Design a protein around this ligand. Structure first.
Ligand SMILES: [Zn+2]
Ligand SMILES: [Zn+2]
Lengths: 468, 48
């Protein structure tokens, strides 16, 4: 099987950390005893020294390869990187062949200790431009209600975190949803039918749906104060209703891995939320879900509770056997061992954090999508920017009826403009594929003149001039 | 003109490895981790 091009590059590099000679070393200069030996990239002591709170899963893959492959014979190639299962094997390899009549300890799911995950799949989410997500908050500034979107992007290496993958996003697509002041809830059938055609155009453009965003602002008084502070240390970090939508999105998009026995493991999916800081701004934060316990129990046992920090655990009806969930908390006198014989266990423990950021404006490798970021989006029907062909006379117009190719190609690289053109499918699919590849790639000057000489682009500007 | 001989016996250990109270993890989430060089994080304003 074949993995991603980014995932195979992190596997080949060892990522060792070099050290220097010290006063504690008693050996010679041409050697190393223990104090200047090469440090492994999975040691968590070096991680918390530089305030890195997770061990960068590609290095966690290396720390399990040392346990799988040894100096001894072995002759196995097991590679035990699989999803730990809480479901019940029906055959059970014993005399209690039905679960209605019989269950023993080798098939019973053990009591969940609630230990936090030490490794994250995505180590650092990054963005492309501050003007891209400024249009997303501007949707709230016009209708006053919450929004929703899906992030399309790619992946590359990250040199800050040892053996880490960074998440790059390029554009944000919004599905048609019904907004509300308190929260939001849309139909999953019309979104999945709409997201199927966007994945078609994302393949030729080199994009993949790897993220989503949802807003939560609660403006205070619209004067000096920006927003309220809903999510803090004493309150919930992520609501339990949005854990369900984050869990189903990770199971729909698996990550291919040759080390896993099933063929897919350790999904690379980000969930970002606009919530605001403690003091005064609308700074965002992102956390992703845990694979070890939460990713498998969401198929059978997650039920909604009235508290945003916790989630209710329901009962067993003849196939849905669940084990007891335990966690430690302080009582009125001291700190005690596991107490939970009670439902509504918290879900903030099962989240691992990420580091969001925006790159510097002075230099970058590329940006690939900065045309205007002011074009009316596809499914923004709550706002007034959902126009017909009247907008195409205002937006591009083949500027001033005779456009220069340095000023014409800079507008054609928009994500939602190219996704609006092919829906009319005036051009051929072969000429459309070279149209979107010219706008997204470099050395575009020889191929842009091929587009203007084609009869399909001439019919597009002729059918636009007669219409309003 | 005689002797006294007696042996001994030991029990080594058991462990549980229980840690990570919930109040330490809630303080563990709300912090920062550092950002390379020019990876500003931004502010924003609106809703006049
Ligand atoms: Zn040494
Ligand atoms: Zn069994």
């Amino acid at each position: 099987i074949k993995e991603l091009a980014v995932d195979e590059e992190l596997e080949k590099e060892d990522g060792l950390i070099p050290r220097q000679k010290s006063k504690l070393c008693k050996h010679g200069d041409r050697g190393m005893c223990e104090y200047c030996s090469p440090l492994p990239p999975w040691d968590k002591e070096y991680h918390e020294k530089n305030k890195i709170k997770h061990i960068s899963f590609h290095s966690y893959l290396k720390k399990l390869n040392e346990n799988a492959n040894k100096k001894e014979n072995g002759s196995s190639y097991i590679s035990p990187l699989s999803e730990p299962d809480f479901r019940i094997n029906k055959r059970c390899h014993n005399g209690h062949e039905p679960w209605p009549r019989g269950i023993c300890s080798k098939c019973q799911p053990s009591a969940i200790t609630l230990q936090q995950q030490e490794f994250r799949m995505v180590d650092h989410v990054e963005f492309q431009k501050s003007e891209i997500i400024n249009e997303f908050i501007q949707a709230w500034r016009y209708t006053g209600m919450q929004r929703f979107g899906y992030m399309y992007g790619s992946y590359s290496k990250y040199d800050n975190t040892p053996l880490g993958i960074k998440a790059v996003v390029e554009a944000i697509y919004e599905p048609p949803q019904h907004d509300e002041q308190d929260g939001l809830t849309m139909d999953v059938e019309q979104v999945k039918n709409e997201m199927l055609q966007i994945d078609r155009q994302a393949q030729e453009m080199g994009l993949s749906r790897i993220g989503l965003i949802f807003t939560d602002l609660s403006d205070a008084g619209a004067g000096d104060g920006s927003v309220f502070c809903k999510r803090h240390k004493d309150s919930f970090f992520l609501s339990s209703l949005e854990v369900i939508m984050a869990a189903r999105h990770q199971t729909r998009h698996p990550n291919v891995s040759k080390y896993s026995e099933q063929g897919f493991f350790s999904s690379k999916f980000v969930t970002c939320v606009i919530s605001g800081n403690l003091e005064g701004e609308i700074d965002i934060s992102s956390y992703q879900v845990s694979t070890e316990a939460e990713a498998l129990v969401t198929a059978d046992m997650i039920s909604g509770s009235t508290f945003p920090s916790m989630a209710y655990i329901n009962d067993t009806t003849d196939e849905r056997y669940v084990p007891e969930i335990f966690y430690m908390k302080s009582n009125e006198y001291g700190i005690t061992v596991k107490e939970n014989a009670k439902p509504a266990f918290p879900v903030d423990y099962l989240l691992v954090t990420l580091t969001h950021g925006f790159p510097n404006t002075d230099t970058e490798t590329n940006s690939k999508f900065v045309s205007s970021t002011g074009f009316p989006w596809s499914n923004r029907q709550a706002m007034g920017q959902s126009q017909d062909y009247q907008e195409l006379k205002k937006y591009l117009f083949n500027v001033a009826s005779s456009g220069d190719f340095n000023l014409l190609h800079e507008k054609i690289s928009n994500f939602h403009l190219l996704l609006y053109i092919n829906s009319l499918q005036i051009l051929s699919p072969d000429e459309w594929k070279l149209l979107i590849e010219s706008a997204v790639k470099n050395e575009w000057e020889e191929s842009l003149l091929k587009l203007v000489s084609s009869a399909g682009w001439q019919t597009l500007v002729m059918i636009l001039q007669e219409s309003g | 003109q005689i002797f006294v001989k007696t042996l001994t016996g030991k029990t080594i250990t058991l462990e549980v490895e229980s840690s990570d109270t919930i109040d330490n993890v809630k303080s563990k989430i709300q912090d920062k981790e550092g950002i390379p060089p020019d990876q500003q994080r931004l502010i924003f304003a609106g809703k006049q």
